[PDB]
């Protein structure tokens, strides 16, 4: 439930005798955790809110100019000086002008001309700082079992902040899922500013919100603003000798939009900013999970397919059954079988133990299950009233292993070293791989990783040729980098 | 030269940058630097202000 | 744990104390308490030895 149709879900199975499993949660998909004798739980990261951000250095992308003025001097006098150069609200530019004996000053050298124009910025952008504290994640989890396909004992919501990283989700009758999580190290919110232009908010990397050539204030907006650049958005174009002219460049809001690329959008509610693209790593201490249904007597009245058979994107099969004759809280017999002569259970039933909880007249329940690759029958019911459905699965285990390796490669390309923590009950091989991946990742991000799609495809083709025809012992080295680089393109 | 009434402003290790309103006056010399701040001085964080 | 041992010396209703400590470089948890009420905090350090 709640991860059936996500199409980016992965199954985390097994544990150290029921102690705990490490799991990384992502905004895109969700994780269904299934244990030996514990109810399958679907866990998803929903929203990340950032709170009380602090304004830093707001820019101007639309200038407006005002009453120009100018002053000229004797070809041989000092330099022009307007009294409006002693005002930090004017842009002033000094140049040389052809002058003399026609304009009014007897001499013929170049003069000196100063032009000043008042500056006013309309609707300038603002970035704000994000501390890795006061940052909240909201995790939604649900349980399989009795919920039909459509205070409720089966779903929980957990708020996790650096000030309280550990929480227990109390699922009534199922016990409680303990959940220890790491909120700080999630997405490295120590280089990302929150940027607004006009009701559109982005996540922006520092070193891109400091190398912007636009008039910038700094922090406290108190009275008549003071813009530091003062020259970029105003163009002092000058005709030789005769004229000086001041124009403003226009509105800049489209040049920023294209400068933003690879920056994440966000949306803001009140003083808080919700990001919908994130990354979180929680350890799941599932040793207080119980099975509600056991000790029930299995239901023997009849079962009817209501929704018949549905296949998810990953191979599993969802079934929605309706139970006719009221027994009570009562167990559902269900299995995958081939050779209906001898009902030998095959495949795996990924739902804990389906149980109907209602006792009114007719009840609805949804289970799902992981059938074998060949043809098979979904068999539901006890005897002489067993409904069977015929189900066919596509691909042999080899294709499954290949798709698993592809998923692992994509998860690594997205997460870095953190990917080694997805199914990380934790050994020594896993830890060693994580360490060497940390080292190689630091090296790679320090050498490359100032490049974009096209740039790295170029340098990848280049080093492919190089490693191909170098003929020394470094060839492999070259070749290795190329996989990395190229893999980073063909996974976006 | 002769100098006159100084003033100053500080910020948290993670806020913007200090800004005196006397920076918009062309009669004041102003200089910006980094100062150690935190937890004694008045804001909880420890970097350079 | 840099502070030598952290002892609360004022007992009226609620007391305040400040300690500091030198954590390892990976992720870690500051654990303050004994059982079932040990508030904890998630803390991350940057650089290898």
């Amino acid at each position: 439930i709640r991860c059936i149709g996500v199409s980016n879900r992965d199954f985390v199975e097994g544990m150290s005798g029921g102690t705990w499993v490490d799991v990384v949660l992502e905004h895109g998909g969700c994780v269904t955790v299934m244990a030996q004798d514990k109810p399958t739980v679907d866990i998803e990261l929903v929203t990340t809110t950032v709170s009380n951000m602090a304004e830093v250095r707001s820019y101007c992308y639309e200038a407006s100019i005002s009453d120009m003025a100018s002053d000229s001097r004797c070809p041989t006098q000092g330099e022009a000086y307007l009294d409006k150069q002693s005002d930090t609200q004017y842009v002033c530019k000094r140049t040389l002008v052809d002058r003399g004996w026609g304009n009014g000053c007897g001499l013929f050298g170049k003069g000196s001309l100063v032009t000043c124009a008042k500056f006013a910025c309309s609707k300038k952008m603002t970035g704000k700082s994000i501390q890795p504290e006061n940052l909240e994640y909201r995790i939604m989890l649900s349980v399989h079992g009795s919920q039909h396909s459509g205070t409720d004992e089966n779903r929980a919501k957990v708020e996790i902040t650096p000030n309280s990283p550990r929480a227990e989700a109390t699922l009534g009758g199922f016990g409680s899922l303990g959940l220890d999580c790491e909120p700080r190290t999630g997405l490295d919110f120590s280089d990302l500013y929150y940027l607004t232009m006009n009701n559109k908010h982005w996540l922006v990397h520092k070193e891109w919100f400091h190398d912007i050539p636009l008039p910038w204030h700094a922090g406290a907006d108190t009275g008549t603003p003071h813009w530091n650049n003062k020259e970029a958005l105003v163009e002092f174009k000058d005709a030789h000798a005769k004229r000086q002219t001041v124009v403003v460049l226009g509105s800049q809001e489209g040049a920023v939009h294209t400068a933003l690329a690879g920056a994440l959008e966000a949306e803001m509610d009140g003083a808080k900013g919700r990001l919908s693209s994130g990354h979180l790593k929680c350890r799941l201490k599932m040793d207080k999970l119980r099975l509600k249904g056991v000790s029930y007597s299995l239901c023997t009245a009849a079962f009817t397919f209501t929704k018949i058979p549905a296949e998810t994107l990953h191979g599993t099969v969802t079934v929605e059954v309706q139970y006719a004759g009221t027994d009570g809280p009562c167990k559902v017999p269900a299995q995958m079988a081939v050779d209906m002569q001898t009902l030998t259970p095959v495949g795996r039933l990924i739902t804990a133990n389906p149980v109907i909880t209602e006792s009114t007249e007719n009840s609805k329940m949804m289970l799902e299950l992981d059938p074998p690759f060949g043809d098979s029958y979904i068999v539901i019911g006890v005897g002489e009233k067993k409904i069977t459905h015929h189900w066919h699965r596509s691909g042999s285990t080899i294709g499954k292993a290949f798709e698993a390796t592809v998923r692992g490669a994509k998860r690594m390309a997205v997460l870095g070293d953190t990917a080694w923590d997805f199914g990380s009950v934790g050994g020594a091989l896993n830890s060693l791989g994580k360490g060497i991946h940390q080292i190689f990742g630091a090296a790679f991000k320090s050498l490359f990783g100032g490049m974009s799609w096209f740039s790295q495809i170029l340098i990848g083709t280049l080093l492919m040729w190089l490693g191909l025809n170098t003929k020394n012992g470094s060839i492999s080295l070259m070749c290795l980098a190329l996989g990395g680089v190229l893999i980073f393109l063909s996974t976006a | 030269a002769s100098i006159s009434d100084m003033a100053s402003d500080s910020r948290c290790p993670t806020q913007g940058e200090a800004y005196l309103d006397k920076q918009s006056d062309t009669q004041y010399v102003c200089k910006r630097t980094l100062v150690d701040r935190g937890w004694g001085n008045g804001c909880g964080l420890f970097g350079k202000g | 744990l840099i502070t030598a041992n952290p002892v609360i010396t004022e007992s009226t209703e609620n007391s305040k104390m400040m300690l500091e400590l030198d954590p390892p470089f990976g992720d870690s948890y500051i654990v303050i308490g004994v059982g079932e009420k040990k508030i904890t905090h998630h803390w991350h350090r940057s650089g290898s030895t």
Epitope: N52, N134 | D5, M6, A7, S8, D9, S10, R11, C12, G40, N41, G42, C43, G44 | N14, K16
Partner: antibody
């Protein structure tokens, strides 16, 4: 440890006044000083401040430009030279002092009895 | 602009022996740097609490302070006759624009 304030009096709009605040019982140089006023029927308003050493001074926007705070550490005296007075400045002024090792920050303070300044036309 | 403090009720009518609770809400994050002052007519304002929970020297124990995010609370367990006065909160965050709240008056009910 006490602060004795003086100099308050009735004056016409546009008049100039000088308030004094003598400190006793502590090292005046190590204390950042502040002026906080309270108009009749209004809450306390923090208007001005000066560091312990006299280096820097702060004035609130409501008083910025007209009032000047200063101090003499040898005579242990804080001065608040207020010019261009307006009827809105009619209030009780208190000088407060706090041990500071940073420009204006302080934790435990000491207050004077206050002095009334009336600006009526 | 400047940080502003809001004291919720502006007036508290209680009888001697009751429990008084005053709240102060800040416009932006201030970690613990909030002070509580008691002001009686004809007397200089008296510092009660600094760092939002620490009682000043000589302050009786019946005054307590608590913080949650931007919401600060001053609690007076056992109201005394001399405890009926005006109470102000002041923000001490990082620089002088320091401000007080509009004040809340504890009146005899």
């Amino acid at each position: 440890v006490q602060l004795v304030e003086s100099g308050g009096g009735l004056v016409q709009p546009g008049g100039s006044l000088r308030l004094s605040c003598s400190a006793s019982g502590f090292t005046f140089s190590t204390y950042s000083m502040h002026w906080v006023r309270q108009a009749p029927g209004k809450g306390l308003e923090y208007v001005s401040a000066i560091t312990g050493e006299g280096d820097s001074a702060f004035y609130a926007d409501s008083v910025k430009g007209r009032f000047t705070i200063s101090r003499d550490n040898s005579k242990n005296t804080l001065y608040f030279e207020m010019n261009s007075l307006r009827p809105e400045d009619t209030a009780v002024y208190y000088c407060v002092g706090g041990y500071s090792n940073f420009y204006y920050y302080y934790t435990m303070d000491v207050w004077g009895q206050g002095t009334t300044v009336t600006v009526s036309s | 602009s400047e940080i502003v403090l809001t004291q919720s009720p502006a007036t508290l009518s209680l009888s001697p022996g009751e429990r008084a609770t005053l709240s102060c809400r800040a416009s932006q994050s201030i970690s613990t740097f909030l002070a509580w002052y008691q002001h009686k007519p004809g007397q200089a304002p008296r510092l009660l609490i600094y760092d939002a929970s620490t009682r000043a020297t000589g302050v009786p124990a019946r005054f307590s302070g608590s913080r949650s995010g931007t919401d600060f609370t001053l609690t007076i367990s056992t109201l005394e006759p001399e405890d009926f006065a005006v109470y102000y909160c002041q923000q001490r965050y990082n620089w002088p624009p320091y401000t007080f709240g509009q004040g809340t008056k504890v009146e005899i009910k």
